[PDB]
């Protein structure tokens, strides 16, 4: 009864459920929890979908059979849910196949699956164009052909809500680098739904310049030009398309960032970070929901020809202005946040090509390749913005890191769970070691005293400055 006691208490959440499901060898508990999944809010359980599906594949049939009923139910009440399952099911198997074929089958998704295939197809073709600008022009043309098929039964799973895609402002699309299988950013027009699953696809509305501009300014320009723009139903979305890059590690980092965000949210630590949504489509390819009002450090330095501090003063005002001190504050909090993330996940390959700066002054790390077992920099440019090593704002940066560390420890188990389950039957480079998760736990330093942690924060920072 001691087990059942816990499970019937308020303490029981989807987190606890998954932990026992993953670890417990008792078939009576597994089945009991399988049923208990239904009582939880769809949104809360949704977050753990990658974990659940992983268990299904790599764990005992008993465990799968406990998971299956809930999954099928959701798939049956939401094609969005169905889609994400099928995509994840496929990606994480290269046991899976039986359910994947069965889920996509009736128990019509062709429009969506063909829609997605074309986007991938486009990207692969751009490989023959060795320059950024050439790719962009080829993209725009080929995107226009998409428009010929615009009003159709498809949606963007990366969207917070259900909807229909109406229009692609192809002229606005841009390619983000010169690489062989370069990713590309596109803007998409949609009409919001109350529910996709019960609603007729909208009717076509007949077609009658791209420059560097803020997001809200970009919506205006696009809206005024758009056929559907008059409608109140109309909204503009955006996604990045990666045709040849694995996003499974990227997804894992996302969950961790979201958890760490919640941890720091539950506690009262004013660290700042920005998780960006991830969509695994294959082990090859995925999509990303981009941050608006932000651009790379590298390009910030190429148009301004300035140093980071100089750019802040130009773009916000002198250190005596409110806008600057606010921006500085947003900078410092975002630096401490991402430092901790980099350390905990052991993120490498850190350079100014991989750090974005938003319009409020936050920095944002993006490339979570090279983490954990697979084998962060505090440059003086960064230290200058903080007012220098003797600066109060810099001292605060160190203060936040400690605070955010103490917070993380209080919820350590929530974090490791996400990673430890994912390691299952895994061939991801981040799991190459024998002790990937074990080393991860050591990095929380649960044994350390706070005085010891103060010292550890200092040690971390000294390392971060050498470059």
């Amino acid at each position: 009864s001691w087990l059942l006691r816990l499970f019937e208490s308020k303490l029981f959440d989807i987190s606890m459920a998954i932990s026992y499901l993953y670890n417990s060898k008792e078939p009576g508990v597994q089945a009991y929890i399988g049923n208990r999944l239904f009582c939880f809010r769809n949104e809360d359980v949704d977050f753990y979908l990658p974990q659940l599906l992983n268990m299904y594949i790599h764990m005992d049939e008993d465990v799968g059979d406990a998971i299956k009923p809930y999954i099928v139910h959701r798939c049956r009440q939401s094609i969005n849910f169905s889609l994400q399952c099928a995509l994840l099911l496929g990606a994480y198997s290269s046991r899976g196949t039986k359910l994947r074929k069965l889920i996509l089958s009736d128990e019509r998704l062709a429009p969506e699956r063909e829609f997605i295939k074309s986007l991938m197809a486009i990207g692969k073709r751009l490989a023959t164009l060795p320059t950024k600008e050439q790719k962009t022009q080829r993209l725009i043309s080929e995107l226009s052909l998409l428009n010929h098929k615009l009003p159709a039964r498809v949606w963007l799973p990366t969207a917070g809500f259900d909807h229909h895609v109406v229009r692609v402002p192809h002229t606005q699309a841009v390619v983000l680098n010169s690489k062989d299988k370069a990713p590309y950013l596109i803007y998409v027009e949609v009409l919001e739904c109350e529910n996709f699953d019960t609603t007729s696809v909208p009717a076509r509305i007949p077609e009658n310049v791209a420059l560097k501009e803020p997001w809200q300014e970009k919506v205006r320009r696009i809206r005024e030009g758009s056929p559907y723009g008059h409608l109140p139903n109309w909204r503009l979305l955006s996604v990045i398309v990666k045709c040849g890059d694995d996003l499974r590690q990227e997804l894992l980092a996302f969950q961790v960032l979201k958890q760490l965000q919640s941890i720091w949210e539950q506690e009262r630590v004013p660290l700042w970070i920005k998780p960006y949504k991830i969509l695994v489509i294959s082990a090859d390819s995925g999509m990303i929901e981009p941050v608006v009002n932000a651009v790379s450090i590298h390009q910030v330095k190429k148009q301004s020809q300035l140093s980071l501090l100089d750019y802040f003063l130009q773009e916000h005002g002198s250190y005596t202005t409110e806008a600057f001190l606010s921006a500085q504050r947003n900078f410092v909090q975002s630096c401490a946040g991402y430092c901790l993330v980099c350390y905990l996940l052991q993120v490498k390959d850190r350079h100014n090509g991989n750090i974005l700066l938003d319009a409020e002054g936050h920095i944002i790390h993006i490339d979570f390749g090279f983490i954990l077992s697979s084998s962060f920099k505090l440059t003086t440019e960064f230290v200058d913005v903080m007012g220098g090593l003797d600066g109060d704002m810099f001292n605060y940066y160190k203060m936040l890191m400690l605070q955010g560390l103490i917070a993380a420890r209080k919820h350590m188990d929530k974090v490791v769970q996400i990673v430890e389950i994912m390691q299952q039957g895994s061939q991801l480079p981040c799991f190459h070691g024998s002790s990937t998760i074990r080393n991860l736990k050591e990095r929380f330093h649960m044994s350390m005293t706070e005085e010891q942690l103060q010292l550890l924060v200092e040690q971390m920072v000294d390392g971060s400055m050498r470059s």
Binding site: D392, N395, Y396, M399, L402, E451
Partner: protein, 162 residues
């Protein structure tokens, strides 16, 4: 225009952090996560026709550096906990060792709403208050009767450097 750095000091529990959230975010909370080291918060006001911005720092291990460059310090005790008032003597010997010898200080009795639990009489405090060179007031972050007054007083008092 100006930039005034102010610190909040006192025994743990006296109410510094809620004072800060009331005055700067007009927010209060009964549930409390302990402050690890230091916080600031900022809000701008006008005194005698001039736009000022106040930077308040809410403070075991003690980096004496944060005391540096503070024009004003609010020294707070809990009216309902005599010991917190008792340690006000030890909190003033510290501040003269590690802080500007010509700094504006306000003594603050917080939680004045707890009338029936009062352990420190207003007269005894203000007596000690004007017996020394500190300005004095009692606040309730909970009811927020004297919180605005306190800052604007000390900030006005401060600007009085010329």
């Amino acid at each position: 225009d100006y930039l005034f750095k102010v610190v909040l000091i006192g025994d743990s529990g006296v109410g510094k952090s809620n004072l800060l959230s009331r005055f700067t975010r007009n927010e209060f909370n009964l549930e409390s996560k302990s402050t690890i080291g230091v916080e600031f918060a900022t809000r701008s006001i006008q005194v005698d026709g001039k736009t000022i911005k106040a930077q308040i720092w809410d403070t075991r291990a003690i980096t004496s550096a944060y005391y540096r460059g503070a024009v004003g310090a609010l020294l707070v005790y809990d009216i309902a906990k005599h010991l917190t008032y008792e340690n006000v003597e030890r909190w003033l010997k510290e501040l003269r060792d590690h802080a500007d010898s010509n700094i504006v200080i306000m003594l603050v009795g917080n939680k004045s709403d707890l009338r029936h639990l009062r352990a420190v009489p207003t007269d005894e405090a203000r007596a000690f208050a004007e017996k020394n060179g500190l300005s004095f007031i009692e606040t309730s972050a909970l009811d927020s009767t004297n919180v605005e007054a306190a800052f604007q007083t000390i900030l006005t008092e401060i600007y009085r450097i010329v």
